[PDB]
PDB file of C-alpha atoms and ligand atoms in Angstrom:
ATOM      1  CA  UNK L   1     -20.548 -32.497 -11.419  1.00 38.62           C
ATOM      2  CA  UNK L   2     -20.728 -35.993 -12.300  1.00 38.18           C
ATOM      3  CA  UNK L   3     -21.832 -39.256 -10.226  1.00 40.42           C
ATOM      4  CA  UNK L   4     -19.859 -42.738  -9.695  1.00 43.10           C
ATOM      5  CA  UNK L   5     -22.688 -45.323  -9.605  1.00 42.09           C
ATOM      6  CA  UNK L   6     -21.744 -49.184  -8.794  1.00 43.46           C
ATOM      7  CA  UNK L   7     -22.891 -50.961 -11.964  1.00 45.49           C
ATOM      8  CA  UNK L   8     -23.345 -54.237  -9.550  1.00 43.67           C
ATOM      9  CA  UNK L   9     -25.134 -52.731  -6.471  1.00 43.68           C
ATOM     10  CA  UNK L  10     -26.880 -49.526  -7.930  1.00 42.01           C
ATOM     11  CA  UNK L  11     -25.119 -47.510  -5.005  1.00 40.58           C
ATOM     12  CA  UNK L  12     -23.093 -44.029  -5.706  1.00 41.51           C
ATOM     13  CA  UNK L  13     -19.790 -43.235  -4.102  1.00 41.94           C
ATOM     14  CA  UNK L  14     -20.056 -40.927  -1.505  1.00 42.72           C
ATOM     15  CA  UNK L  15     -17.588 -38.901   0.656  1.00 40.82           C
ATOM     16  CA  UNK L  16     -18.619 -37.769   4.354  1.00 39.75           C
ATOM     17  CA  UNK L  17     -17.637 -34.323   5.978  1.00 37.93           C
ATOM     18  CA  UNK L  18     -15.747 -36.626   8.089  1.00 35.86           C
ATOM     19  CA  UNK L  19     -13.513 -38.223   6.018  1.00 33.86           C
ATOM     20  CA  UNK L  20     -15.245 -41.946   5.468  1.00 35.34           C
ATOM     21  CA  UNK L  21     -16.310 -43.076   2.349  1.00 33.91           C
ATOM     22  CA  UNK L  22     -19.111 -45.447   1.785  1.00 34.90           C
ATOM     23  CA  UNK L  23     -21.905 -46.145  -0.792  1.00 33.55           C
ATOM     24  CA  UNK L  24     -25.421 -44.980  -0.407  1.00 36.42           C
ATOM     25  CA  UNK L  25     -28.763 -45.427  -2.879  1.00 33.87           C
ATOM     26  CA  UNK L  26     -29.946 -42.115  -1.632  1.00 34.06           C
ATOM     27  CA  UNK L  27     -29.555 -40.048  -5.001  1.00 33.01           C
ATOM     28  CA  UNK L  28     -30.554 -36.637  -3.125  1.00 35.78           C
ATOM     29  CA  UNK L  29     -27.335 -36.786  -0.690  1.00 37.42           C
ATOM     30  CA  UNK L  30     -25.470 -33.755  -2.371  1.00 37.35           C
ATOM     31  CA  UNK L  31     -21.999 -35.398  -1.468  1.00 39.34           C
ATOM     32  CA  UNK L  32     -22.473 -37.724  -4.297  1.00 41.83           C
ATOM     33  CA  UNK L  33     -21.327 -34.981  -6.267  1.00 43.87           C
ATOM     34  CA  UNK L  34     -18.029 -35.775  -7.787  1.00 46.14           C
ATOM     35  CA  UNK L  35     -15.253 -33.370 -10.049  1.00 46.85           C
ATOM     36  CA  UNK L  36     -13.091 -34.990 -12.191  1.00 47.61           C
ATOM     37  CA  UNK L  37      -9.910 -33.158 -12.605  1.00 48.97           C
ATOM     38  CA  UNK L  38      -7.095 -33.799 -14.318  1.00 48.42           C
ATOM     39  CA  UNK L  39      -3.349 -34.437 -13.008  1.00 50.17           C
ATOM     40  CA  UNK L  40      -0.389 -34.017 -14.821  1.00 50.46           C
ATOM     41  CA  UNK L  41      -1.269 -35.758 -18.550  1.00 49.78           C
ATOM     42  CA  UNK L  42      -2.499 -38.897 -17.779  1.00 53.27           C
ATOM     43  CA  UNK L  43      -4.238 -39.148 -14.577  1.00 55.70           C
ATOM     44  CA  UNK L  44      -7.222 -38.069 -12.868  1.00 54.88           C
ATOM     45  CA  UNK L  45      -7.888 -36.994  -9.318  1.00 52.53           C
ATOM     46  CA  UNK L  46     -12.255 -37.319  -8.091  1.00 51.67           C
ATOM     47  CA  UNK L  47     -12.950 -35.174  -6.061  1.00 51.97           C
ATOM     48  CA  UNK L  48     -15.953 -34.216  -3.812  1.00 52.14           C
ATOM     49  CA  UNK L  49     -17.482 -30.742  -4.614  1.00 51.49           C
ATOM     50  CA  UNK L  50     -19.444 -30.392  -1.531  1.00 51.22           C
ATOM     51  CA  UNK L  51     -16.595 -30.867   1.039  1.00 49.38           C
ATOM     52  CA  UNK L  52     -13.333 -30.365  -1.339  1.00 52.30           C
ATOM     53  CA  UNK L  53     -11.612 -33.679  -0.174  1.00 50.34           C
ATOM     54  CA  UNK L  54      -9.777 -35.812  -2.743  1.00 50.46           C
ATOM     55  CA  UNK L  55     -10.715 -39.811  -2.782  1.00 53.36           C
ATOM     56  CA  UNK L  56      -7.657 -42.424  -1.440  1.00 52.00           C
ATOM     57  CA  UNK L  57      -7.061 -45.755  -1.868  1.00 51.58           C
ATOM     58  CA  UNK L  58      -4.636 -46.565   1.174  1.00 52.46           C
ATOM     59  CA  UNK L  59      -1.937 -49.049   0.676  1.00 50.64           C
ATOM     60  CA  UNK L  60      -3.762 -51.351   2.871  1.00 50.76           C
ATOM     61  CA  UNK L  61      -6.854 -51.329   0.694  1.00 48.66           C
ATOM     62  CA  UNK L  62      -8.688 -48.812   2.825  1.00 49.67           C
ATOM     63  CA  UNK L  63     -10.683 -46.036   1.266  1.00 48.26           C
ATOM     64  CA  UNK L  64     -10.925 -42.338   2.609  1.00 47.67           C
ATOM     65  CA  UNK L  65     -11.005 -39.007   2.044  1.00 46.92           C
ATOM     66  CA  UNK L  66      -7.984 -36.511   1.856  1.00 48.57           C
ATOM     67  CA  UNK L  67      -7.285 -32.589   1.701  1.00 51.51           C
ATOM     68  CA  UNK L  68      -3.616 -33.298   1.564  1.00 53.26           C
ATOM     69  CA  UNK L  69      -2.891 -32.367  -2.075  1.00 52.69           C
ATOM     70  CA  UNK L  70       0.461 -33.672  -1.700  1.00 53.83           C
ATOM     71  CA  UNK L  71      -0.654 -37.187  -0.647  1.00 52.23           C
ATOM     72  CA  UNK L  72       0.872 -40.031  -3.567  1.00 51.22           C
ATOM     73  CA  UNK L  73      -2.331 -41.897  -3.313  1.00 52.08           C
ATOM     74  CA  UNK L  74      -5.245 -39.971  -5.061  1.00 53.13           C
ATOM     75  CA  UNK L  75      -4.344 -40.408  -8.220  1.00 53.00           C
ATOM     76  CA  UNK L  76      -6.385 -42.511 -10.717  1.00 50.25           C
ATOM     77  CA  UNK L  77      -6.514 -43.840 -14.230  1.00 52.63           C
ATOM     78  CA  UNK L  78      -9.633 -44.353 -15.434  1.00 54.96           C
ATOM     79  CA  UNK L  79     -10.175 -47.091 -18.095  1.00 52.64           C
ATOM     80  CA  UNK L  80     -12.996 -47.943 -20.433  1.00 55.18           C
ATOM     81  CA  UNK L  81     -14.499 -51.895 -19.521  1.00 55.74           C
ATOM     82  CA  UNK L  82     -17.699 -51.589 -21.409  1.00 56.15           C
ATOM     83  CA  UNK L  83     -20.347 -51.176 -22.121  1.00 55.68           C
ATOM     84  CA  UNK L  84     -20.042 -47.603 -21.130  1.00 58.08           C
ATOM     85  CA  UNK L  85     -18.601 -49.277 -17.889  1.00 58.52           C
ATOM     86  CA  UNK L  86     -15.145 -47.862 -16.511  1.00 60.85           C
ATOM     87  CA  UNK L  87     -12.838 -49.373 -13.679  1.00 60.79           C
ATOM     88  CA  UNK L  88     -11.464 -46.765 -11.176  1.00 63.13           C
ATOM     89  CA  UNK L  89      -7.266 -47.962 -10.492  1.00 62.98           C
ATOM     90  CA  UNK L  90      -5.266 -45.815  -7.673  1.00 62.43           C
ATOM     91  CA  UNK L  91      -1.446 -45.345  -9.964  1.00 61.75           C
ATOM     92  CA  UNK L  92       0.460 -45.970  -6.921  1.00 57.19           C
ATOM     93  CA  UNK L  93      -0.942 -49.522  -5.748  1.00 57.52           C
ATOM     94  CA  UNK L  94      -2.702 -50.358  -8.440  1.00 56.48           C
ATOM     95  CA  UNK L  95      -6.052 -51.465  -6.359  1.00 57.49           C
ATOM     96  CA  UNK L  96      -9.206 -51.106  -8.072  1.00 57.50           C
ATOM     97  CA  UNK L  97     -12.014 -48.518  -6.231  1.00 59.43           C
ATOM     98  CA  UNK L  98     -14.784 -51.301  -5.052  1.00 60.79           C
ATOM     99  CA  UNK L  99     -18.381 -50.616  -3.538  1.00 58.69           C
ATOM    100  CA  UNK L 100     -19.584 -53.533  -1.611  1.00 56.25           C
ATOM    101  CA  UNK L 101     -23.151 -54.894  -1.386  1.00 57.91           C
ATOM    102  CA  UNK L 102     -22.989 -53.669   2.585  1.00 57.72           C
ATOM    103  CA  UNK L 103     -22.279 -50.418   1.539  1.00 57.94           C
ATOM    104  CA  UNK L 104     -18.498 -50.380   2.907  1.00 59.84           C
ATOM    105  CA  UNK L 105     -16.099 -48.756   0.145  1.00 59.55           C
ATOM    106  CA  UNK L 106     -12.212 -50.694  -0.947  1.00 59.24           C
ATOM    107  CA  UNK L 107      -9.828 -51.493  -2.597  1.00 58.43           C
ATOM    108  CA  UNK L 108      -8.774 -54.645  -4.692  1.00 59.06           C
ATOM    109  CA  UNK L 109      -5.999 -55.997  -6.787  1.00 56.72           C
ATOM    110  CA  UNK L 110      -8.749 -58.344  -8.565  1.00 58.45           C
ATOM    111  CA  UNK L 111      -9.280 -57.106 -11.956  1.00 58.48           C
ATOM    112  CA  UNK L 112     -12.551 -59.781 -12.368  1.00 55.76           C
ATOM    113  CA  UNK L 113     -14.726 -58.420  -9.494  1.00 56.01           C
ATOM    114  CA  UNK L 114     -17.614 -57.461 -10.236  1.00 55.54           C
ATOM    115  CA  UNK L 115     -17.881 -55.253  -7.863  1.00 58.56           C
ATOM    116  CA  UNK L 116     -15.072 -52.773  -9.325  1.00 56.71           C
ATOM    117  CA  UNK L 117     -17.222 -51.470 -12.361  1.00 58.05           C
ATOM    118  CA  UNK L 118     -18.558 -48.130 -12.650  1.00 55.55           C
ATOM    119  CA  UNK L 119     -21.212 -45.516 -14.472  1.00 55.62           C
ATOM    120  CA  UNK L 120     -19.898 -42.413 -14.463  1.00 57.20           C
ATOM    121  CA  UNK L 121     -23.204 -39.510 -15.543  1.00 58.72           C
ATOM    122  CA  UNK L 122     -23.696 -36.267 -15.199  1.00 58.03           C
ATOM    123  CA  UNK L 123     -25.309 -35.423 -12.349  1.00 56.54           C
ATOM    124  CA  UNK L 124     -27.790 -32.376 -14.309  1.00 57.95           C
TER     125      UNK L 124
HETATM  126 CL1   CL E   1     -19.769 -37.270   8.324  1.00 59.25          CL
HETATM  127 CL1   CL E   2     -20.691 -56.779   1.572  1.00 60.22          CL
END
């Protein structure tokens, strides 16, 4: 598994049992665990491998988690920023994945946030 770390904030990505996401600094939560997989030829879905749920960005910007395999909205490009910095962009709105300093989890359209960038590492 692999981890998706706010460069800005120092918090990981995490999806709940209950479908919320949020960010948390706790690195011994096991649902920061993340599996890239890959859609298709160009795309990327991330999902959790504690719980199985896919992340979505909603077309209103808000951020959740899905078991709906069929659902348009969990599929993501990720591209390189640097330095070994990536930016997480939902194909079908084009809204960045954002981790805010009060630990709530979005979208946005703004490439130049700086809260948009991510690490992604291996987890061990
Ligand atoms: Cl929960
Ligand atoms: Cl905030």
């Amino acid at each position: 598994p692999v981890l998706l770390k706010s460069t800005e904030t120092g918090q990981y990505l995490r999806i709940n049992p209950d479908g919320t996401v949020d960010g948390t600094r706790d690195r011994s939560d096991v649902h920061i665990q993340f599996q890239i997989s890959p859609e298709g030829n160009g795309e990327v879905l991330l999902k959790s491998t504690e719980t199985g749920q896919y992340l979505r960005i909603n077309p209103d910007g808000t951020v959740d988690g899905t078991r709906d395999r069929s659902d348009v909205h969990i599929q993501f490009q990720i591209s390189p920023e640097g330095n070994g910095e990536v930016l997480l962009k939902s194909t079908e709105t084009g809204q960045y994945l954002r981790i805010n300093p009060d630990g709530t989890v979005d979208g946005t359209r703004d490439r130049s946030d700086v809260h948009i960038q991510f690490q992604i590492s291996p987890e061990g």
